[PDB]
Amino acid sequence: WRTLVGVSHTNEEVRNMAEEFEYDDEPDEQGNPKKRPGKLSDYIPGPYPN
Amino acid sequence: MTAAEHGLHAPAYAWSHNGPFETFDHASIRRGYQVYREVCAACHSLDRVAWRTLVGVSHTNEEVRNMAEEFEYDDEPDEQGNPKKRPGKLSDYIPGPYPNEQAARAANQGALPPDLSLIVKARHGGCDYIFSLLTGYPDEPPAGVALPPGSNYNPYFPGGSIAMARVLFDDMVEYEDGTPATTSQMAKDVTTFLNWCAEPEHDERKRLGLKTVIILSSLYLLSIWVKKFKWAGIKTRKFVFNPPKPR
Amino acid sequence: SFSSLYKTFFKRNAVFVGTIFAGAFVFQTVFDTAITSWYENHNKGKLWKDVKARIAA
Amino acid sequence: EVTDQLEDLREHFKNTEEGKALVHHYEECAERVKIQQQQPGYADLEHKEDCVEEFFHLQHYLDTATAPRLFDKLK
Amino acid sequence: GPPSGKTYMGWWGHMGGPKQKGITSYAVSPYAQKPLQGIFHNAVFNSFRRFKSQFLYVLIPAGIYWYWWKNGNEYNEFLYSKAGREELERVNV
Amino acid sequence: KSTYRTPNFDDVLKENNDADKGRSYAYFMVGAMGLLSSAGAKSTVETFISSMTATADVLAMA
Amino acid sequence: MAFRKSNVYLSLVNSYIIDSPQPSSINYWWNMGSLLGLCLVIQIVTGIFMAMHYSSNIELAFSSVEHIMRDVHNGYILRYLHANGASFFFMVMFMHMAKGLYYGSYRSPRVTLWNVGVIIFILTIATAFLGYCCVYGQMSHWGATVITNLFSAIPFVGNDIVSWLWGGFSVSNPTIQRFFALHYLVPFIIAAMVIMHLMALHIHGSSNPLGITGNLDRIPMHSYFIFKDLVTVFLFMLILALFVFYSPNTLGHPDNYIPGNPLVTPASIVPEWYLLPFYAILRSIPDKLLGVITMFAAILVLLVLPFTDRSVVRGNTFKVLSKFFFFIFVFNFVLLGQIGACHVEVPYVLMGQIATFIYFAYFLIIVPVISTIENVLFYIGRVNK
Ligand code: HEC
Ligand code: HEM
Ligand code: HEM
- For A33, other C-beta atoms within 10 Å of its C-beta total 11
Contact A49 B106 (CB under 8 A): no
> What residues contact G278, with CB distance under 8 A and at least 6 apart?
G125, G295, G298, G299, G340
CA of G6 to the centre of ligand 1 (A): 71
Is B152 a pocket residue for ligand 1 (Cβ < 6 Å)? Answer: no
Catalytic residue among G20, G140, G141, G229: G229
Q: Among positive and negative, which fits the CA dihedral G165, G171, G175, G176?
A: positive
* Residue F16 DSSP class: -
Determine the longest span between alpha carbons in chain D, in angstroms.
53
Q: Please report the atom of ligand 1 found closest to the CA of residue B42.
A: 5
Contact E20 G218 (CB under 8 A): no
> What share of residues in chain A are helix, strand, coil (percent, to 5)?
20, 15, 65
- Residue type for G262, please? P
CA of E32 to the centre of ligand 1 (A): 71
CA distance G259 to G139: 9
Query: Was B124 annotated as part of a binding site?
Result: no
Would you tell me the crossing angle of helices G138-149 and G173-202 to the nearest 10 degrees? 70
- Residue type for G189, please? I
The method recorded for this entry reads: cryo-EM
* Residue B41 DSSP class: G
Pair G227, G100: CB distance under 8 Å: no
Burial label for C23, CB within 10 Å (0-12, 13-18, 19+), is: middle
Query: Was B127 annotated as part of a binding site?
Result: no
Residue of B43, B108, B153 best suited for mutating to test ligand 1, as the one with most atoms within 8 Å of CB: B43
Pair D32, D49: CB distance under 8 Å: yes
* Residue B54 DSSP class: G
Backbone angles phi, psi at G267, to 5 degrees: 70, -5
G-chain residues near B157 (CB < 8 A): none
Contact G241 B212 (CB under 8 A): yes
The SS3 call for residue F46 is helix
E-chain residues near D49 (CB < 8 A): 82
Pair G160, G3: CB distance under 8 Å: no
Return the CATH number of D1-75, one of 2.60.120.10, 2.60.34.10, 1.25.40.10, 1.10.287.20. 1.10.287.20
SS3 per-residue string spanning chain G: CCHHHHCCHHHHHHHHHHCCEEECCCCHHHHHHHHHHHHHHHHHHHHHHHHCCCCCCCCCHHHHHHHHHHCECCHHHHHHHHHHHHHHHHHHHHHHHHHHHHCCCCCCCCHHHHHHHHHHHHHHHHHHHHHHHHCCEHHHHHHHHHHHHHHHHCCCCHHHHHHHHHCCCCCCHHHHHHHHHHHHHHHHHHHHHHHHHHHHHHCCCCCCCCCCCCCCCEEECCCCHHHHHHHHHHHHHHHHHHHHHCCCCCCCCHHHHCECCCCCCCCCCCCCHHHHHHHHHHHHCCCHHHHHHHHHHHHHHHHHHHHHCCCCCCCHHHCHHHHHHHHHHHHHHHHHHHHHCCCCCHHHHHHHHHHHHHHHHHHHHHHHHHHHHHHHHHHHCCCCC
DSSP line for C2-49: HHHHIIIIISSHHHHHHHHHHHHHHHHHHHHHHHHHHHHHHS-SSSHH
Catalytic residue among G228, G311, G322, G374: G228
CA distance B149 to G152: 41
CA distance G44 to G142: 26
CA distance B73 to B68: 10
List the CATH number of the domain containing F39: 1.20.5.270
Is B167 a pocket residue for ligand 1 (Cβ < 6 Å)? Answer: yes
The SS3 call for residue B28 is helix
Chain breaks in chain B (C to N over 2.5 A) after: none
A-chain residues near B79 (CB < 8 A): none
DSSP line for chain E: -------S---TT--S-----SEEEE---GGGB-TT-SHHHIIIIIHHHHHHHTSHHHHHHHHHHHHHHHHHHHHHHHHTSSTTHHHHHHHH-
Domain count for chain F, please give it.
1
E-chain residues near G204 (CB < 8 A): 7-9
Q: List the single residue in G with minimal CA-CA distance to E90.
A: G346
Please give the radius of gyration of chain B, using alpha carbons only, rounded to the nearest integer: 28
Considering only the beta carbons, identify the residue of B21, B26, B206 that sits closest to C48. Answer: B26
Ligand 2: residue whose CA is nearest its atom 1? G187
Q: List the single residue in F with minimal CA-CA distance to G75.
A: F51
Considering only the beta carbons, identify the residue of A27, A28, A49 that sits closest to B81. Answer: A49
In G1-23, which positions are buried (b, 16+ CB within 10 angstroms) versus exposed (e)? eeebeeeeeebeebbeebbbbbb
Answer left, alpha or beta for residue G22, where phi above 0 means left and psi between -120 and 50 means alpha.
beta
CA distance B231 to G227: 9
The SS3 call for residue B47 is coil
- Architecture of the E1-93 domain: Up-down Bundle (1.20)
Is G148 a pocket residue for ligand 3 (Cβ < 6 Å)? Answer: no
Domain range enclosing G369: 1-385
CA distance B29 to B31: 6
Cα G258 to the chain's mean position, in Å?
A: 27
Ligand 2: residue whose CA is nearest its atom 30? G48
The structure was resolved to a resolution in Å of 3.3
F-chain residues near G74 (CB < 8 A): 47-48, 50-51
> What share of residues in chain F are helix, strand, coil (percent, to 5)?
65, 5, 35
For residue A13, what are the CA distances in angstroms to A6, A45, B114, B137, G256? 10, 17, 45, 61, 47
CA of G82 to the centre of ligand 2 (A): 6
- For B52, other C-beta atoms within 10 Å of its C-beta total 20
CA distance G85 to F48: 16
Burial label for G198, CB within 10 Å (0-12, 13-18, 19+), is: middle
Q: Which domains does chain B have, with CATH numbers?
A: 4-200 (1.10.760.10), 201-247 (1.20.5.100)
Note if G323 is an active site residue. Answer: no
CA distance D27 to D35: 12
Which helix (H) or strand (E) segment is B177 a member of? none
CA distance G54 to G176: 12
Contact G348 E72 (CB under 8 A): yes
Query: Was G202 annotated as part of a binding site?
Result: yes
Catalytic residue among G34, G272, G319, G322: G272
Residue C54 to chain F, least CA–CA distance (Å): 28
Pair E58, G327: CB distance under 8 Å: yes
Comparing CA positions, the residue from G76, F55, G42, G250 lying closest to residue B205 is G76
Ligand 1: residue whose CA is nearest its atom 39? B40
F-chain residues near G72 (CB < 8 A): 51, 55
Q: Bridge-partner residues for E26, per DSSP?
A: B238
CATH H superfamily, domain C1-57: Cytochrome b-c1 complex subunit 9 (1.20.5.260)
Domain count for chain G, please give it.
1
CA of G11 to the centre of ligand 3 (A): 22
Answer left, alpha or beta for residue F48, where phi above 0 means left and psi between -120 and 50 means alpha.
alpha
Comparing CA positions, the residue from G228, G220, G193 lying closest to residue G5 is G220
Determine the longest span between alpha carbons in chain E, in angstroms.
79
Q: Bridge-partner residues for A36, per DSSP?
A: A23
Comparing CA positions, the residue from B155, B145, B132 lying closest to residue B4 is B155
Q: Bridge-partner residues for G72, per DSSP?
A: F55
CA of G97 to the centre of ligand 3 (A): 7
Residue of G108, G331, G334 best to disrupt the E interface, most CBs of E under 10 A: G331
Domain range enclosing F39: 1-55
The SS3 call for residue A35 is strand
Establish how many alpha carbons lie within 13 A of residue E25's alpha carbon, considering only the half-sphere containing its beta carbon. 11
Q: How many CB pairs under 8 A join D and E?
A: 3
CA of B164 to the centre of ligand 1 (A): 5
Ligand nearest to the CA of B151: 1
Q: Bridge-partner residues for B240, per DSSP?
A: E24
Residue F33 to chain E, least CA–CA distance (Å): 16
Residue of G67, G91, G123, G183 best suited for mutating to test ligand 2, as the one with most atoms within 8 Å of CB: G183
CA distance B152 to B164: 7
Is B200 in the C-facing interface, judged by CB distances under 8 Å? no
Q: List the single residue in A with minimal CA-CA distance to B99.
A: A31
CA of G33 to the centre of ligand 3 (A): 5
Contact A30 B99 (CB under 8 A): no
List the CATH number of the domain containing G107: 1.20.810.10
Query: Was B172 annotated as part of a binding site?
Result: no
Listed by start position, the domains of chain E span 1-93
Note if G228 is an active site residue. Answer: yes
Residue E53 to chain F, least CA–CA distance (Å): 27
CA distance A27 to D4: 43
Chains touching D by CB (3 or more pairs below 8 Å): B, E
D-chain residues near E81 (CB < 8 A): 53
Is C44 in the B-facing interface, judged by CB distances under 8 Å? no
Ligand 2: residue whose CA is nearest its atom 12? G132
Which helix (H) or strand (E) segment is F3 a member of? none
Note if G206 is an active site residue. Answer: yes
Pair A6, A40: CB distance under 8 Å: no
Ligand 3: residue whose CA is nearest its atom 7? G33
Backbone angles phi, psi at B2, to 5 degrees: -70, 165
Q: C with G: 3 or more CB pairs under 8 Å?
A: no
- For C33, other C-beta atoms within 10 Å of its C-beta total 10
Which helix (H) or strand (E) segment is F54 a member of? none
Pocket of ligand 2 (CB under 6 A): G 40, 43-44, 47-48, 50-51, 54, 65, 68, 79, 82-83, 86, 89, 124, 127-128, 131-132, 134-135, 183-184, 187, 190, 252
Helix extents (H) in B89-245: 101-107, 127-135, 183-198, 202-235
Burial label for B216, CB within 10 Å (0-12, 13-18, 19+), is: buried
